[PDB]
Amino acid sequence: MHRTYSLRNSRAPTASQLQNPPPPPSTTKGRFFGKGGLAYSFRRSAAGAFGPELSRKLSQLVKIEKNVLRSMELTANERRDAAKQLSIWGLENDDDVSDITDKLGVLIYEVSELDDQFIDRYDQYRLTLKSIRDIEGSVQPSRDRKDKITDKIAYLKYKDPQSPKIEVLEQELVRAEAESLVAEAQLSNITRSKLRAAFNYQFDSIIEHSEKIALIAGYGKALLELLDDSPVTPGETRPAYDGYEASKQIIIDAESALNEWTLDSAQVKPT
Amino acid sequence: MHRTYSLRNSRAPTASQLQNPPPPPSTTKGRFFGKGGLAYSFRRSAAGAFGPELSRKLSQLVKIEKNVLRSMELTANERRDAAKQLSIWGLENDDDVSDITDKLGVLIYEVSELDDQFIDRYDQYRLTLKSIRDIEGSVQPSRDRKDKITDKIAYLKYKDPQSPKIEVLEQELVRAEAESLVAEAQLSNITRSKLRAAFNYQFDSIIEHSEKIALIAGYGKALLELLDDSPVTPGETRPAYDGYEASKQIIIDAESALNEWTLDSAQVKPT
Ligand SMILES: O=P(O)(O)O[C@@H]1[C@H](O)[C@H](O)[C@@H](OP(=O)(O)O)[C@H](OP(=O)(O)O)[C@H]1O
Numbered sequence: 001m002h003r004t005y006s007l008r009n010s011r012a013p014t015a016s017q018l019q020n021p022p023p024p025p026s027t028t029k030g031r032f033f034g035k036g037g038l039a040y041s042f043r044r045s046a047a048g049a050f051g052p053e054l055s056r057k058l059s060q061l062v063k064i065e066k067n068v069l070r071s072m073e074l075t076a077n078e079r080r081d082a083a084k085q086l087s088i089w090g091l092e093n094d095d096d097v098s099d100i101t102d103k104l105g106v107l108i109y110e111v112s113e114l115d116d117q118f119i120d121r122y123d124q125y126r127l128t129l130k131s132i133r134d135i136e137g138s139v140q141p142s143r144d145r146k147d148k149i150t151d152k153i154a155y156l157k158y159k160d161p162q163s164p165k166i167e168v169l170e171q172e173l174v175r176a177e178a179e180s181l182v183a184e185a186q187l188s189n190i191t192r193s194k195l196r197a198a199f200n201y202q203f204d205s206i207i208e209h210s211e212k213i214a215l216i217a218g219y220g221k222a223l224l225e226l227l228d229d230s231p232v233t234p235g236e237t238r239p240a241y242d243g244y245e246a247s248k249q250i251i252i253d254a255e256s257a258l259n260e261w262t263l264d265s266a267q268v269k270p271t
Numbered sequence: 272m273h274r275t276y277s278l279r280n281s282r283a284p285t286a287s288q289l290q291n292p293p294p295p296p297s298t299t300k301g302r303f304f305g306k307g308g309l310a311y312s313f314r315r316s317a318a319g320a321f322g323p324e325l326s327r328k329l330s331q332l333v334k335i336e337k338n339v340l341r342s343m344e345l346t347a348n349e350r351r352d353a354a355k356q357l358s359i360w361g362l363e364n365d366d367d368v369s370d371i372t373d374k375l376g377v378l379i380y381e382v383s384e385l386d387d388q389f390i391d392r393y394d395q396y397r398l399t400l401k402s403i404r405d406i407e408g409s410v411q412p413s414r415d416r417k418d419k420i421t422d423k424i425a426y427l428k429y430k431d432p433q434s435p436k437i438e439v440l441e442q443e444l445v446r447a448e449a450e451s452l453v454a455e456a457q458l459s460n461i462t463r464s465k466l467r468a469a470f471n472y473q474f475d476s477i478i479e480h481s482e483k484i485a486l487i488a489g490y491g492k493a494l495l496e497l498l499d500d501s502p503v504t505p506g507e508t509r510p511a512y513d514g515y516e517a518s519k520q521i522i523i524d525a526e527s528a529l530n531e532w533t534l535d536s537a538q539v540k541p542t
């Protein structure tokens with residue numbers, strides 16, 4: 001988060017924000033529950049009511065992550081349709097305009113397919129989170145039994161300190177305690193391992209997607225440079241278009257670079 | 272698109288796809304209309320029925336782009352909630368685990384706010400597309416009148432070649448034609464200018480967002496390195512955690528780098 005020490009819900013402008021004023025807030029921000037509907041909210045609340053207490057939060061996280069994946073795939077499909085129909089509109093235009101919008105449509109198609117691949121990786125990470133949820137929520141009943149048996153032992157001791165069940169219940173409490181402390185140890189180990197692996201995978205997918213999208217954007221801007229933005233004076237003829245070969249090579253190079261990209265090929269250097 | 276010349280709906284694996292097998296397709300791909308509901312589809316169809324013919328496609332593009340923006344803001348809010356509640360789950364864990372998941376939550380919060388900024392830029396680009404739609408759809412009725420008047424002139428000439436209305440209608444046809452050819456010229460000019468500017472803005476926002484997300488991912492992986500993934504043997508104690516200062520400096524550096532990022536500071540070099 002970028003907030004400086006102030007009560008303001010506004011952050012100090014960065015270098016990009018200093019370069020130009022930020023655009024006004026989106027006009028599509030309507031008034032609603034802030035999420036669109038209620039069925040997924042009911043699912044989330046059910047995850048927050050019925051599940052075991054100590055696993056309830058992680059089950060809710062898994063459900064919300066599934067919602068995020070659903071929304072991401074839906075918006076990827078919608079972006080694909082938008083690119084297709086944008087190029088459809090650009091078909092009946094100037095030949096230069098038609099070619100430029102067609103190539104932009106292909107680039108957005110690549111962006112959509114890369115989004116789909118990142119979505120598959122994101123679902124793999126979500127499955128890992130589901131696995132850690134499962135193991136930890138199945139290790140919870142050990143401590144549940146420990147708490148129940150210690151409460152029963154306290155109640156029996158208060159009611160009848162000389163009851164014969166005291167010794168056997170004490171052995172059982174010891175046994176659940178040996179079952180439980182070291183189970184906590186194993187749970188911590190597996191939680192650390194699974195969390196580290198899943199988040200490393202997720203961040204590798206994130207950086208790969210970001211770098212591929214950045215390369216696509218750079219190639220698209222270089223190809224936009226090809227577009228002739230010089231206006232033609234009223235009443236004049238249309239100059240001939242000869243950018244087929246240049247955009248031809250540009251899209252060829254974009255595909256070649258996308259094939260060539262590797263995890264080590266990432267040029268992002270954190271400091 | 273990455274498809275090689277084959278009937279396969281499968282693309283040759285890239286270097287990243289060669290490094291490891293791709294994950295299986297997402298398990299959340301349910302059976303439905305492929306989009307979730309019907310109200311937005313009705314809106315899109317109304318955009319594809321009632322509007323002027325030559326502006327109908329661009330109006331549909333604007334509507335679909337609004338749908339994309341709505342979905343993007345919804346998924347950004349859901350990702351924000353997911354990060355918050357993930358860190359909420361990580362609160363009651365190991366102190367190292369609590370700190371690492373808290374910092375990851377902050378990083379995903381930054382990702383969400385950057386998504387919101389990119390969404391604002393994307394809506395600015397959508398507004399530019401709306402503007403070009405408006406001007407071009409308002410220039411369409413000139414050609415509509417030209418076609419109507421030429422049809423009327425042909426019908427009148429066939430019905431009565433010596434009708435007195437022939438000369439005045441011919442002058443009006445000339446006048447609409449002088450109104451229309453050069454209007455086509457101006458429309459081509461304004462379309463080129465608006466499209467180039469809007470797509471340059473969109474691609475600049477895209478590359479900025481991608482680079483910021485890539486820096487966030489790199490810093491997050493470097494911070495995940497801080498996590499102690501070494502398992503502890505059963506029955507042993509918990510080693511003391513001392514990573515507060517290291518993650519302290521890591522998040523400080525991440526914020527500093529995010530402030531320092533400029534458009535020229537982008538390190539992506541298309542070839
Ligand atoms: O004032 P009203 O009667 O409620 O209608 C609004 C506005 O006048 C436009 O018709 C429309 O924007 P466009 O001109 O771009 O179609 C907008 O839709 P929007 O919010 O989805 O943009 C409507 O909400």
Ligand SMILES: O=P(O)(O)O[C@@H]1[C@H](O)[C@H](O)[C@@H](OP(=O)(O)O)[C@H](OP(=O)(O)O)[C@H]1O
Pocket residue numbers: 062063066130298299
């Ligand atoms: O086959 P169904 O009837 O569609 O139900 C699916 C599955 O059987 C589980 O109930 C659930 O996973 P869990 O066992 O972990 O709850 C999953 O949710 P998910 O995709 O969010 O994991 C559901 O989609």
